Amino acid sequence: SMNIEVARAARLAQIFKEICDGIISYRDSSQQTLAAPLLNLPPKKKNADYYEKISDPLDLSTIEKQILIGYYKTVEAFDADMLKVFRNAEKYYGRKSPIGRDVCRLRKAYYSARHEASAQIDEIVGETASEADSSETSVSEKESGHEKDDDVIRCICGLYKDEGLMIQCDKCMVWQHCDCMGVNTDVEHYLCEQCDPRPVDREVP
């Protein structure tokens, strides 16, 4: 049977291949592959701590292979994987920019090629995948609303008041009380019941 969905998936697949190819083997004038620290997972044996917090470090050379197998299908998941390796790079390697300037350069050429490939995506996917040319590295829409400060309360309580103990959504940078959400104030990368609702299967019949 004919499916536009499988045509779109395979279309973008070989096309992602183009873009990710430029990034994987992106070289400076001295012929250095800047994406090297991201394209290869590190020796697992001497990194329990690393993989404890970063339980999903990811690997570009593997993402590449996963592109051709048509696992991502659309750009949604594709763009996720790329922005993931860059962000965890900047996260644990150092303060905030360790290899940052190196992989952010890749990221810049990534968005450039993203912008480039937006042509075909337009003809294939359309506008349901939007443009995704809003810069940044964290979120794409960023705002996606009206307000979203660091000091803003957002709990199911509805009080909008900074009382008791509460943690911060890594993406919203909003405050949610620990007792309500079922937290232990131990979360390093907590996400809210919106961005990524974490399901806790506590002995549910």
Binding site: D162, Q168, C178
Partner: peptide, 12 residues
């Protein structure tokens, strides 16, 4: 992730 423990945290 930052953790608030009552908005006021005056220590002295």
């Amino acid at each position: 992730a930052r953790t608030k423990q009552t908005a006021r945290k005056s220590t002295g």
